[PDB]
Structures are given as structure tokens and as C-alpha cells.
């Protein structure tokens, strides 16, 4: 291991090496032109090949951190452009590396990347495929500076495949656009989880995280023994703790080690882990992370034996409380992959509470029996919600389903901005389209996965612009009571109906030309303002207003004259609706 850079070059390969180096530099030097980074990439690459040919070369023995920090300090416009960051260069390793991480800017001031014309993209993709993909990879990296580089490279390859398919099909846009939308969503979904998980570790501590890890690991690796799960949880915590620090190399090494250990102890962990452990170093940790759940052993008892009817229960618990609780969580999780992680945590928390209570009583054996009865109400709560919402999603369309959620959440928290209500409603609706197509056995985990980011995304916007105390309470409570807290929200009887605005309910003929998406957007916007104006409106009354509006749109988008119809029949529609409500 004379040369870190040479070893990395051999493992990753030239292509991947180039991309990762581009991303790394782009995440630090977020305000340097693309051509600047291309020069850096080529300089580092050629030096790497130097080390590949001879690990005893002049600078090949240097550390990856040292080489990287050295290149950064060679940038001429470094002090002019980044100011304080240039002061890091005066420091010594390893102090210098820590300094560069501190002055890493998160979400700087850059214009939003506008998706160009399909014809323009495919033409550029054809003429200069490399400079086209790399230039965009540079644009994404500089904007999402804390996104794990290898993951960011994972999406880039998928983007390349999307253009390869569609850019030589007759109807390109019909192929490409739906794919680019899928990536954009997954890209921000993956980016949301990453910050959420890192925020959890800092906010609730390692214990709550370990409890979360024990649950999901036991679900994925039900055949694994508790001792094996403990080790995995322990190292998983060490990985995310380091990964959230920000150091790419250190983070990469920890993930690689874990993937290294898991593949070597494959028989001791999971059976459905063969393909992932066959893939290259760059795809190992990624493949394992989202591996399919292994199928649990056929002969599995109930927990009542070791956690209820058994003696020495308090003895074993008091001997090592978190361990014992972890064992309960392990045993319960491996049996219920159909459960959300948080649900298992609620159950474990419940089991914890009773042991603290009953183990102090005269005869603890009694208060044990109470426990498992307490689980049912907690379990069926998320189950009933899923059944009802999916049935609602089945009867009404997704769009109509979004509208239903729209009126519901508007009546619960009318203070929320209209654009925000419209966004979360459409998102929750999309969650319904995705998860409700799963059978019950896999619905709850699916819902947890999507709602977690939607709810945290929601609390983030509320963080910057607070509007409701009730919403703030849910956003600041335990991540196990977050979703339930939101579901506990009732209609706001405090809300004073906002004053009428004619412009808000004035429609023009332009909506007839609007895309099917933004026509819904403007209609859903008007719906939110309608509920905000008269919140005490019933479902029948509202449906009556919505029907008249729907017919009003068809009668003006079907006539010879259009703008006059929207202005005149628009006056009629508004006057008639005001009277009914
Ligand atoms: C990573 C390389 C990205 C390649 C795709 C370029 C188009 C990006 C579109 C951005 C968007 O969807 O808003
Ligand atoms: C001279 C310094 C150049 C810096 C080059 C950065 C190299 C990054 C190496 C990333 C390897 C990550 C391997 C995959 C690990 C994982 O499972 O996530
Ligand atoms: C390998 C052992 C991991 C540690 C297991 C700890 C089990 C804790 C059980 C209580 C659920 C934790 C939920 C968040 C914190 C809390 O509410 O107590
Ligand atoms: C799925 C359909 C999505 C419709 C939006 C409302 C979903 C309500 C059910 C969510 C259940 C969340 C489970 C998390 C938990 O167990 O605490
Ligand atoms: C910036 C503040 C945003 C406020 C958002 C108001 C809308 C709240 C929506 C809550 C969704 C709850 C999802 C869980 C399912 C349920 O129990 O209904
Ligand atoms: C005061 C009352 C104002 C009357 C204006 C009625 C605005 C209606 C807005 C909601 C439109 C719902 C359309 C349903 C659909 O998507 O087809």
C-alpha cells in the first residue's frame, strides 16, 4: 500500500476514477468554472498513472488527503474567490483537511438547473457525449456538495442510459421526460434521506439510531443471529457517524470495510446476498444497502417464552437493559418485515415502559401479560390508515385523491401557504400510487419510507418559515411519534376565514393550453383558496362547487369564443358559489 492513489486507481478503474475526482473537486471548489476542474482531473489522473507504473514515484507515497489538499491550495483564484478557505492551506495535515470540510458551503447561491429541450439535449449528447454528461455531473455536484460521491456517480450512469435509449427513438420526449422525472425524484429522495438520517444521529443520539438499525437489520437478515446483528449495528453506527462528518475518503473506507465483512460472512448473515457481493468495490456497499429481505426460518416460536412467561426476565433485563430490549426488538423485527421500523420501535418502547414499571412491583410476572395486549392497538393504527387511504385511492383517481387530501390538510392547518399545501398533497397522492399497488404485507414499510422524507421535508420548510405551533410540535418530537402526531391533527376551529379575493377565483382561457400537470396545479391551488375562504364548507357543498367549476371549464374550452366565456360565465360561477356557501 505504498501508493493510496495508485491502489484507488486500480480498484476503481480510470473512468470511475475520473468521475469521482471531478465530483470531489466540484463539491469543494463550487464556484470554479467547469474547465478548471477538467484540468485538475487530468492532472490528478496522469499523476495517478505515474504511481500505477511505479509506486516508488516522487509523490506517489503521499496521502490522498495530502494530495487533494495540495491541489486545492494550488488554485490561483482561491483566496480571491473563497477567502477563508484559502487560510486552511496555512494549516498542517490533518488539521488542513478538517478546515476544508468546515468551509464546505451547503446549498450556495446558484441558479436552478433548467431542463433544456429534448432535441437540444439529445443533439448535445450525440455530438459530445462525454463533455455533456461530465458538465452536468459537475453542475449537480457543485449544488449538492454533501451528496455521497459514489451515489452521485450511481445516478449519472443511470442518466447516461436514459439518453442512450430515448435519443434514437421516434418519440424521444415521451421516453426521456418520464425517465428524467424518475431520476430527479429519486435523486432528491436519496438526498433527503441522507440529511434526515444524519440529522437523527445528531438529534436523538446513537441509542435511538442503534434501535432503528437493529430493527431494519433484523428485518433484512432474519436468519442472522443477534450477536451478528449487534456487530452489524455497531459498525453501521460507526459508518454513518463518520459518513455524516463529511470526509469522502474516510466514509468510503468504512463502507467498503463493512461490505467487505458482510460478503465474507455471507452464510452467517443472509442468503440473498450473492449477487451484491459479486459486484465491484464501487457497487458493493450500495448493493447491500438496498438488498432484498431474506426469508425468515420456518420454525420460529413466539416471544412470549423469553419475554413474558419466562422467569429471570427482570434479572436478564436489569443485567443489560439496552441489550435485552435490543434482543426483543431483534426477535420482533425478524418476524415482522411487514411492519414499519418506527412501529417496531413503538412496540419496543412500550415493552420498555412496562418493564420499568412492573419490575419494581411486588410480582412482575403479572404486569408482563398486560404487555402484548398493548401492542395490538399500536399495530393496527398504521394498518387501518393504510387500508382506508388505499381504498380511497382506489375509488377516486390519483388526482382526485390528491384533492381529497388537499381539503383535509387545508382544514387541519389552514395557516400553511397555498403552494406548500398543494405540493405535499400531490406528493402524498403519489405515495398512494406507489405503495397501494403493494399487497398489505409490504405496504407499511413502503409508506414509512416515503412519508419519512415528505414529513421531514415538510418540517424543514416549517423550520425556515414557522406558521403553526401544532406542526412545530410534531416536527420537533421523537421520530417515532412524528407521523402519528401529524395524523392526530384535527380541523382548526381557531382559523378565521381569509377575506374574499375576486382575482383568486378569476380564470382566463390560458388554462386551456396549459399542460395536464399545471392545469391541475392551478385547479388545486384554487381549491385550497376555496377551502381557506370558507373552511366550514361540507364535502357535498364543496363537491357542488367543484362540479360547477369543472363544467365551467369545459363550456369555455369548447366554445368558439373563449376569453369572454371565462369572464362572463366566470362571474356567474363565482356569484352562485358565494351564495351556496
Ligand atoms: C449526472 C448527469 C446528469 C445528466 C442529465 C442532464 C439533465 C439534467 C436535468 C436536470 C433536471 O432534471 O432538473
Ligand atoms: C489525489 C486525490 C484524489 C481523490 C480521489 C477520490 C477517490 C474516491 C474513492 C471512492 C471509493 C469508494 C468505493 C465505494 C465505497 C462504497 O461502498 O460507497
Ligand atoms: C444492539 C442493541 C441496540 C440498542 C437497543 C436499544 C433499544 C431501545 C428500545 C426503545 C426504543 C428506542 C426509541 C427511541 C428512544 C426511546 O423512545 O426510548
Ligand atoms: C400509503 C398511502 C399514502 C396516503 C397518505 C397517508 C398515509 C397514512 C398511512 C401512513 C402510515 C405510516 C406508517 C408509519 C408508522 O407506523 O408510524
Ligand atoms: C410548512 C408547514 C407545512 C404544514 C403541512 C400541513 C399538512 C400536514 C399533512 C400531514 C400528513 C400526515 C401524513 C400521515 C397520514 C395521516 O395520518 O393522515
Ligand atoms: C367563493 C367560491 C368561489 C368559486 C370558485 C370555485 C373554484 C373551484 C376550485 C377547485 C376546482 C376543482 C376542479 C376539479 C378537477 O380537477 O376536475
XYZ file of C-alpha atoms and ligand atoms in Angstrom:
682
model
C 0.000 0.000 0.000
C 2.839 2.379 -0.877
C 0.544 4.496 -3.031
C -3.029 5.240 -1.972
C -3.794 6.931 -5.283
C -2.370 4.001 -7.260
C -4.410 1.479 -5.286
C -7.567 3.554 -5.745
C -6.910 3.829 -9.486
C -6.565 0.050 -9.827
C -9.708 -0.720 -7.817
C -11.985 1.890 -9.372
C -10.691 1.959 -12.934
C -9.755 5.014 -14.988
C -13.292 6.047 -15.949
C -14.763 5.830 -12.448
C -11.628 7.411 -11.006
C -12.023 10.443 -13.282
C -15.694 10.901 -12.426
C -15.163 10.604 -8.672
C -12.274 13.078 -8.765
C -14.432 15.504 -10.745
C -17.197 15.236 -8.149
C -14.822 15.607 -5.200
C -13.291 18.817 -6.541
C -16.659 20.168 -7.660
C -18.063 19.750 -4.149
C -15.236 21.831 -2.665
C -14.481 24.353 -5.406
C -18.170 25.024 -6.021
C -17.546 28.393 -7.691
C -14.882 27.442 -10.243
C -15.723 27.028 -13.962
C -16.095 23.514 -15.397
C -12.925 23.851 -17.472
C -10.970 24.493 -14.276
C -11.996 21.135 -12.816
C -11.306 19.262 -16.051
C -7.711 20.481 -15.845
C -7.475 19.312 -12.236
C -8.969 15.910 -13.101
C -6.481 15.324 -15.920
C -3.566 16.443 -13.750
C -4.532 14.095 -10.909
C -5.305 11.259 -13.320
C -1.977 11.431 -15.136
C -0.175 11.610 -11.804
C -2.131 8.535 -10.707
C -0.983 6.579 -13.771
C 2.538 7.651 -12.826
C 2.038 5.978 -9.453
C 0.434 2.971 -11.154
C 3.552 2.365 -13.241
C 5.835 2.891 -10.233
C 4.572 3.202 -6.655
C 8.033 4.485 -5.747
C 7.481 7.656 -7.776
C 8.290 11.127 -6.461
C 4.957 11.994 -4.833
C 3.116 8.671 -5.048
C 3.808 7.854 -1.399
C 1.746 10.842 -0.249
C -1.643 10.572 1.456
C -4.870 11.054 -0.510
C -5.858 13.867 1.832
C -2.443 15.466 1.380
C -2.538 15.243 -2.418
C -6.098 16.569 -2.519
C -5.430 19.481 -0.175
C -2.265 20.195 -2.140
C -4.184 20.538 -5.405
C -6.791 22.758 -3.742
C -4.093 25.122 -2.458
C -2.641 25.392 -5.970
C -5.726 27.185 -7.258
C -4.655 30.748 -8.031
C -8.013 32.463 -7.532
C -8.511 30.531 -4.289
C -8.244 33.459 -1.865
C -9.986 35.885 -4.230
C -12.960 33.559 -4.648
C -13.274 31.548 -1.428
C -11.457 33.807 1.037
C -11.343 31.976 4.370
C -10.906 28.585 2.708
C -7.507 29.773 1.480
C -6.497 30.147 5.131
C -6.904 26.379 5.530
C -3.846 25.978 3.301
C -1.667 27.531 6.004
C -2.679 24.692 8.311
C -0.936 21.333 8.539
C -2.381 17.877 7.966
C -4.573 16.547 9.400
C -5.766 19.971 10.590
C -5.928 21.232 6.999
C -8.427 18.585 5.890
C -10.731 19.378 8.807
C -10.537 23.040 7.855
C -11.552 22.376 4.245
C -14.573 20.419 5.478
C -15.646 23.269 7.765
C -15.633 25.813 4.922
C -17.618 23.498 2.677
C -20.648 25.510 1.562
C -24.025 23.761 1.691
C -26.541 24.949 -0.913
C -24.716 28.079 -2.152
C -26.303 30.748 -4.335
C -26.675 29.264 -7.809
C -29.453 29.434 -10.411
C -31.706 26.377 -10.689
C -30.670 23.962 -13.431
C -33.263 24.306 -16.180
C -34.039 21.141 -18.139
C -33.357 22.098 -21.792
C -35.292 20.978 -24.872
C -35.215 17.241 -25.588
C -33.944 17.980 -29.097
C -31.201 20.158 -27.626
C -30.146 17.539 -25.059
C -30.042 14.558 -27.437
C -28.139 16.633 -30.007
C -25.556 17.606 -27.404
C -25.487 14.037 -26.103
C -24.670 12.845 -29.620
C -22.082 15.488 -30.561
C -20.118 15.478 -27.297
C -21.399 12.689 -25.057
C -18.562 12.938 -22.528
C -18.432 16.706 -22.023
C -22.219 16.676 -21.861
C -22.527 14.129 -19.048
C -19.492 15.382 -17.122
C -20.565 19.017 -17.377
C -23.932 18.154 -15.856
C -22.298 15.897 -13.261
C -20.242 18.948 -12.349
C -23.373 21.089 -12.114
C -25.152 18.637 -9.810
C -22.114 18.070 -7.595
C -21.390 21.772 -7.023
C -25.009 22.207 -5.925
C -25.298 19.160 -3.699
C -21.768 19.311 -2.063
C -22.557 16.830 0.719
C -24.082 14.158 -1.522
C -22.061 10.935 -1.317
C -19.873 10.936 -4.445
C -20.287 7.250 -5.372
C -24.071 7.631 -5.101
C -23.910 10.720 -7.292
C -21.955 8.604 -9.781
C -24.664 5.936 -9.484
C -27.310 8.370 -10.753
C -25.083 9.725 -13.519
C -24.719 6.284 -15.093
C -28.493 5.902 -14.984
C -28.848 9.292 -16.686
C -26.461 8.146 -19.418
C -28.561 5.043 -20.029
C -31.719 7.153 -20.275
C -30.312 9.220 -23.134
C -28.911 6.154 -24.884
C -32.408 4.676 -25.133
C -34.632 7.620 -25.970
C -32.390 9.833 -28.108
C -32.763 7.406 -31.018
C -36.479 6.715 -30.678
C -39.142 8.451 -32.790
C -40.937 9.983 -29.812
C -37.947 10.966 -27.676
C -39.720 13.244 -25.200
C -42.331 10.580 -24.445
C -39.479 8.264 -23.476
C -36.935 10.637 -21.944
C -39.037 13.072 -19.890
C -40.776 10.352 -17.826
C -37.331 8.896 -17.095
C -35.663 12.169 -16.162
C -38.561 12.844 -13.788
C -37.995 9.468 -12.124
C -34.321 10.306 -11.608
C -34.998 13.824 -10.300
C -37.383 12.376 -7.713
C -35.054 9.548 -6.677
C -32.142 11.983 -6.646
C -33.843 14.337 -4.197
C -35.398 11.417 -2.333
C -31.948 9.929 -1.770
C -30.630 13.374 -0.863
C -33.444 13.906 1.637
C -32.911 10.616 3.477
C -29.172 11.248 3.758
C -29.621 14.512 5.646
C -32.528 13.098 7.642
C -30.523 10.089 8.802
C -27.530 12.282 9.667
C -29.814 14.711 11.498
C -31.296 11.846 13.523
C -27.893 10.623 14.724
C -27.122 14.143 15.960
C -30.595 14.920 17.305
C -31.580 11.743 19.171
C -28.189 10.150 19.798
C -26.635 6.796 18.918
C -29.081 4.797 21.067
C -32.169 5.759 19.073
C -30.170 5.139 15.904
C -28.927 1.744 17.089
C -32.522 0.874 17.946
C -33.507 1.859 14.410
C -30.638 -0.153 12.912
C -31.417 -3.256 14.977
C -34.973 -3.191 13.656
C -34.223 -2.863 9.944
C -31.194 -5.167 10.024
C -33.218 -7.894 11.744
C -35.897 -7.483 9.088
C -33.351 -7.809 6.285
C -31.301 -10.573 7.894
C -33.834 -12.649 9.906
C -31.628 -15.745 9.605
C -28.756 -13.876 11.252
C -28.204 -14.370 14.974
C -28.467 -11.461 17.411
C -24.720 -11.428 18.015
C -24.183 -10.988 14.284
C -26.816 -8.246 14.127
C -25.208 -6.446 17.074
C -21.851 -6.331 15.299
C -23.518 -5.101 12.104
C -25.440 -2.434 14.008
C -22.285 -1.402 15.855
C -20.278 -0.961 12.660
C -23.266 0.554 10.857
C -23.329 3.255 13.522
C -19.581 3.807 13.192
C -20.095 4.171 9.430
C -22.892 6.757 9.478
C -21.242 8.712 12.287
C -18.165 9.036 10.089
C -20.163 9.464 6.867
C -22.129 12.357 8.363
C -18.836 14.041 9.295
C -18.302 14.767 5.597
C -14.950 13.172 4.754
C -15.417 11.288 1.472
C -12.367 9.023 1.730
C -12.888 8.080 5.386
C -16.568 7.448 4.659
C -15.749 5.329 1.603
C -13.242 3.201 3.523
C -15.737 2.472 6.303
C -18.467 1.413 3.866
C -16.022 -0.749 1.929
C -14.882 -2.493 5.122
C -18.479 -3.218 6.159
C -19.364 -4.554 2.710
C -16.102 -6.488 2.899
C -17.079 -8.160 6.175
C -20.677 -8.878 5.162
C -19.752 -10.657 1.924
C -17.145 -12.768 3.704
C -19.673 -13.813 6.345
C -22.479 -14.228 3.843
C -23.690 -17.593 5.145
C -23.836 -16.124 8.646
C -25.925 -13.145 7.561
C -28.208 -13.616 4.566
C -28.738 -15.872 1.562
C -29.962 -13.209 -0.861
C -26.564 -11.516 -0.782
C -24.745 -13.390 -3.555
C -25.101 -11.000 -6.497
C -24.242 -7.903 -4.473
C -21.043 -9.474 -3.130
C -20.053 -10.374 -6.698
C -20.193 -6.766 -7.911
C -17.174 -4.385 -7.909
C -15.959 -2.369 -4.909
C -17.811 0.728 -6.084
C -21.171 -1.057 -6.129
C -20.732 -3.348 -3.109
C -21.887 -1.076 -0.292
C -24.663 0.340 -2.481
C -25.978 -3.095 -3.475
C -26.000 -4.448 0.085
C -27.657 -1.313 1.481
C -30.820 -1.948 -0.519
C -30.708 -5.733 -0.664
C -33.932 -7.733 -0.629
C -35.149 -9.127 2.697
C -34.071 -12.703 3.363
C -36.839 -15.204 4.094
C -37.195 -15.994 7.798
C -36.833 -19.522 9.249
C -39.999 -21.634 9.169
C -39.727 -22.818 12.774
C -39.948 -19.636 14.850
C -41.568 -19.564 18.323
C -43.382 -16.640 19.931
C -41.601 -14.021 22.040
C -43.865 -14.871 24.979
C -41.435 -17.599 26.032
C -38.321 -15.477 26.569
C -40.012 -12.118 27.158
C -43.239 -12.887 29.041
C -43.765 -16.274 30.690
C -40.082 -16.855 31.465
C -38.551 -16.268 34.873
C -35.362 -14.228 35.276
C -36.949 -11.712 32.903
C -36.169 -8.786 35.190
C -32.836 -10.381 36.035
C -31.868 -10.573 32.356
C -33.274 -7.108 31.666
C -31.590 -5.359 34.593
C -28.355 -7.170 33.742
C -28.170 -5.248 30.456
C -31.267 -3.215 29.639
C -30.498 -1.978 26.124
C -29.139 -5.383 25.122
C -32.262 -7.163 26.357
C -34.511 -4.566 24.714
C -32.423 -4.989 21.575
C -32.994 -8.732 21.722
C -36.736 -8.125 21.980
C -36.508 -5.752 19.019
C -34.437 -8.289 17.091
C -36.863 -11.145 17.725
C -39.897 -9.000 16.936
C -38.396 -7.424 13.807
C -37.259 -10.637 12.103
C -40.806 -11.985 12.436
C -42.456 -8.861 11.045
C -40.912 -7.447 7.845
C -44.448 -6.251 7.123
C -44.011 -3.713 9.921
C -42.540 -0.245 9.606
C -39.326 0.282 11.557
C -40.886 3.006 13.704
C -43.789 0.698 14.594
C -41.393 -1.889 15.988
C -39.734 0.918 17.920
C -43.065 1.985 19.359
C -43.640 -1.609 20.482
C -40.139 -1.864 21.968
C -40.624 1.455 23.747
C -43.900 0.061 25.077
C -42.196 -3.114 26.315
C -39.502 -0.963 27.906
C -42.028 1.204 29.746
C -43.813 -1.740 31.345
C -40.609 -3.455 32.499
C -39.530 -0.239 34.224
C -42.961 -0.213 35.854
C -43.660 -3.865 36.676
C -40.115 -4.952 37.592
C -40.462 -2.562 40.526
C -43.743 -4.164 41.600
C -44.267 -6.938 44.153
C -44.771 -9.596 41.478
C -43.625 -8.522 37.976
C -44.997 -11.678 36.315
C -48.473 -10.115 36.334
C -47.724 -6.820 34.572
C -45.940 -8.790 31.842
C -49.167 -10.258 30.474
C -50.519 -6.729 30.051
C -47.717 -6.003 27.586
C -48.570 -7.966 24.439
C -52.172 -6.771 24.634
C -50.823 -3.227 24.452
C -49.171 -3.996 21.113
C -52.342 -4.665 19.125
C -53.775 -1.124 19.297
C -50.413 0.339 18.234
C -50.043 -2.168 15.398
C -53.489 -1.768 13.846
C -53.337 2.028 13.912
C -50.984 2.316 10.905
C -52.711 -0.704 9.341
C -56.166 0.904 9.396
C -54.771 4.132 7.941
C -53.249 2.245 5.007
C -56.381 0.215 4.303
C -58.630 3.274 4.310
C -56.362 5.543 2.268
C -55.698 2.895 -0.379
C -59.421 2.164 -0.705
C -59.942 5.903 -1.108
C -57.115 5.871 -3.648
C -58.914 3.051 -5.455
C -62.333 4.699 -5.668
C -61.053 8.135 -6.652
C -58.247 8.708 -9.133
C -54.787 9.806 -8.009
C -55.630 13.403 -8.990
C -58.999 13.252 -7.259
C -57.243 11.520 -4.353
C -54.820 14.430 -4.113
C -57.805 16.766 -3.995
C -59.299 14.793 -1.103
C -56.067 15.075 0.885
C -55.942 18.720 -0.165
C -59.219 19.657 1.526
C -58.384 17.529 4.559
C -54.973 19.026 5.325
C -56.162 22.522 4.434
C -58.924 22.247 7.040
C -56.444 20.904 9.589
C -53.770 23.561 9.076
C -55.242 26.468 7.045
C -52.336 28.745 8.021
C -49.947 26.847 5.740
C -49.023 28.558 2.466
C -51.096 27.519 -0.560
C -48.089 26.374 -2.647
C -46.925 24.197 0.252
C -50.332 22.539 0.735
C -50.516 21.830 -2.997
C -47.052 20.262 -3.043
C -47.394 17.915 -0.064
C -50.888 16.864 -1.161
C -49.700 15.836 -4.620
C -46.714 14.089 -3.045
C -48.831 12.110 -0.583
C -51.026 11.199 -3.532
C -48.030 9.864 -5.427
C -47.148 7.877 -2.310
C -50.591 6.319 -2.634
C -49.955 5.326 -6.241
C -46.642 3.712 -5.330
C -47.363 1.919 -2.062
C -51.006 0.933 -2.546
C -50.066 -1.275 -5.502
C -48.200 -3.418 -2.982
C -50.033 -6.103 -1.004
C -50.611 -5.416 2.707
C -47.523 -7.448 3.616
C -45.277 -4.732 2.159
C -47.395 -1.571 2.343
C -46.456 -0.218 5.777
C -42.679 -0.254 5.203
C -43.246 1.416 1.819
C -45.372 4.175 3.370
C -42.819 4.737 6.136
C -40.082 5.138 3.544
C -41.831 7.876 1.553
C -43.685 9.644 4.373
C -40.425 9.985 6.293
C -38.924 12.257 3.651
C -42.197 14.038 2.879
C -42.770 14.713 6.580
C -39.175 15.780 7.210
C -39.155 17.855 4.014
C -42.324 19.393 5.413
C -40.737 20.144 8.790
C -37.732 21.689 7.034
C -39.841 24.278 5.209
C -41.613 24.908 8.504
C -38.245 25.341 10.201
C -37.408 28.317 7.996
C -40.934 29.750 7.944
C -42.915 28.747 11.066
C -46.698 29.018 10.792
C -48.309 26.622 13.261
C -47.341 25.558 16.773
C -49.043 22.194 16.313
C -46.960 21.496 13.212
C -43.822 22.556 15.063
C -44.608 20.168 17.915
C -44.812 17.196 15.561
C -41.642 18.266 13.737
C -39.692 18.544 16.993
C -40.882 15.379 18.746
C -39.374 11.896 18.521
C -39.098 10.479 15.003
C -41.312 7.651 16.237
C -44.162 9.981 17.207
C -43.723 12.331 14.252
C -46.096 10.684 11.782
C -48.660 9.732 14.466
C -48.553 13.320 15.747
C -49.431 14.574 12.262
C -52.267 12.041 11.984
C -53.538 13.341 15.313
C -54.133 16.750 13.760
C -57.771 17.819 13.739
C -59.662 20.538 11.870
C -58.634 24.019 13.023
C -61.608 25.643 14.753
C -59.454 28.683 15.512
C -58.981 29.655 11.874
C -60.658 32.843 10.688
C -61.693 32.523 7.002
C -59.471 34.668 4.771
C -61.167 37.586 3.034
C -62.624 37.061 -0.428
C -60.494 37.859 -3.480
C -62.019 38.025 -6.966
C -58.632 37.684 -8.656
C -58.019 34.446 -6.775
C -61.131 32.945 -8.375
C -60.747 34.600 -11.767
C -59.834 32.264 -14.617
C -58.709 33.000 -18.170
C -58.555 30.935 -21.369
C -54.818 30.288 -20.989
C -55.541 27.291 -18.766
C -56.917 25.543 -21.850
C -53.405 25.485 -23.303
C -51.627 24.668 -20.039
C -50.113 21.213 -19.618
C -52.192 18.496 -17.972
C -49.943 18.914 -14.944
C -50.116 22.668 -14.389
C -53.809 22.762 -15.226
C -54.262 20.522 -12.200
C -51.826 22.703 -10.255
C -53.846 25.860 -10.865
C -57.072 23.991 -10.121
C -55.676 22.535 -6.896
C -54.417 25.991 -5.934
C -57.913 27.416 -6.414
C -59.294 24.551 -4.325
C -57.017 25.374 -1.391
C -58.020 29.042 -1.550
C -61.655 27.958 -1.723
C -61.334 25.914 1.466
C -59.371 28.728 3.115
C -62.093 31.225 2.206
C -64.946 29.098 3.537
C -63.437 26.350 5.746
C -66.784 25.383 7.270
C -67.897 24.077 3.875
C -69.182 20.498 3.739
C -67.975 17.794 1.354
C -71.243 17.935 -0.574
C -71.176 21.737 -0.822
C -67.535 21.661 -1.927
C -68.203 18.902 -4.446
C -71.052 21.022 -5.786
C -68.700 23.970 -6.237
C -66.053 21.753 -7.841
C -68.535 20.226 -10.291
C -69.807 23.629 -11.422
C -66.199 24.704 -11.911
C -65.343 21.571 -13.879
C -68.326 22.072 -16.174
C -67.452 25.776 -16.347
C -64.033 24.900 -17.758
C -65.418 22.540 -20.402
C -68.065 25.033 -21.519
C -65.454 27.734 -22.113
C -62.790 25.482 -23.661
C -65.363 24.168 -26.135
C -66.884 27.430 -27.362
C -65.919 29.462 -30.425
C -65.193 32.480 -28.252
C -63.270 31.659 -25.087
C -61.908 34.624 -23.136
C -65.368 36.189 -22.935
C -66.869 32.972 -21.561
C -64.268 32.764 -18.790
C -65.026 36.377 -17.871
C -68.828 36.263 -18.068
C -69.725 32.715 -17.009
C -66.846 33.120 -14.582
C -68.808 35.943 -12.991
C -71.848 33.654 -12.842
C -69.912 30.747 -11.325
C -68.383 32.926 -8.599
C -71.652 34.605 -7.630
C -73.558 31.323 -7.471
C -70.884 29.639 -5.350
C -70.633 32.512 -2.866
C -74.373 32.202 -2.265
C -74.431 28.446 -1.663
C -71.555 28.616 0.823
C -25.448 13.439 -13.612
C -25.525 13.872 -15.060
C -26.879 14.441 -15.424
C -27.237 14.174 -16.871
C -28.640 14.628 -17.214
C -28.696 16.082 -17.626
C -30.082 16.666 -17.469
C -30.334 17.147 -16.057
C -31.746 17.651 -15.864
C -31.934 18.314 -14.518
C -33.362 18.201 -14.031
O -33.997 17.123 -14.185
O -33.915 19.186 -13.476
C -5.331 12.829 -5.195
C -6.676 12.692 -4.512
C -7.773 12.203 -5.437
C -9.084 11.925 -4.728
C -9.885 10.831 -5.405
C -11.094 10.389 -4.604
C -11.304 8.889 -4.665
C -12.626 8.433 -4.080
C -12.664 6.935 -3.858
C -14.067 6.413 -3.621
C -14.114 4.918 -3.388
C -15.472 4.455 -2.914
C -15.656 2.972 -3.122
C -17.078 2.568 -2.825
C -17.358 2.592 -1.345
C -18.831 2.461 -1.073
O -19.383 1.335 -0.926
O -19.513 3.506 -1.010
C -27.757 -3.856 19.889
C -28.551 -3.065 20.905
C -29.069 -1.761 20.337
C -29.753 -0.907 21.381
C -31.198 -1.301 21.598
C -31.962 -0.252 22.375
C -33.455 -0.491 22.347
C -34.243 0.739 22.737
C -35.723 0.447 22.852
C -36.541 1.713 22.952
C -36.879 2.272 21.588
C -35.993 3.449 21.239
C -36.741 4.567 20.540
C -36.080 5.918 20.697
C -35.687 6.192 22.124
C -36.821 5.890 23.072
O -38.015 6.227 22.813
O -36.522 5.283 24.131
C -49.863 4.765 1.635
C -50.867 5.795 1.169
C -50.383 7.205 1.416
C -51.514 8.140 1.780
C -51.056 9.214 2.741
C -51.401 8.875 4.174
C -50.780 7.573 4.637
C -51.283 7.155 6.003
C -50.651 5.871 6.496
C -49.179 6.051 6.774
C -48.634 5.007 7.718
C -47.280 5.425 8.239
C -46.597 4.291 8.961
C -45.513 4.781 9.890
C -45.755 4.328 11.307
O -46.076 3.131 11.505
O -45.650 5.126 12.276
C -44.664 24.406 6.404
C -45.710 23.674 7.216
C -46.362 22.549 6.439
C -47.617 22.026 7.102
C -48.226 20.859 6.356
C -49.713 20.740 6.602
C -50.244 19.425 6.082
C -49.982 18.299 7.058
C -50.060 16.939 6.397
C -49.815 15.801 7.366
C -49.636 14.468 6.672
C -49.777 13.295 7.615
C -49.423 12.002 6.923
C -49.741 10.814 7.800
C -51.047 10.144 7.446
C -52.216 10.591 8.285
O -52.324 10.212 9.487
O -53.074 11.335 7.751
C -66.393 31.695 -3.388
C -66.471 30.486 -4.294
C -65.527 30.596 -5.470
C -65.906 29.654 -6.592
C -64.710 29.226 -7.412
C -64.571 27.722 -7.463
C -63.132 27.294 -7.635
C -63.002 25.790 -7.701
C -61.576 25.336 -7.498
C -61.465 23.827 -7.451
C -61.546 23.188 -8.819
C -61.564 21.675 -8.751
C -61.562 21.059 -10.134
C -61.692 19.550 -10.122
C -60.946 18.872 -11.255
O -59.708 18.682 -11.168
O -61.569 18.487 -12.280
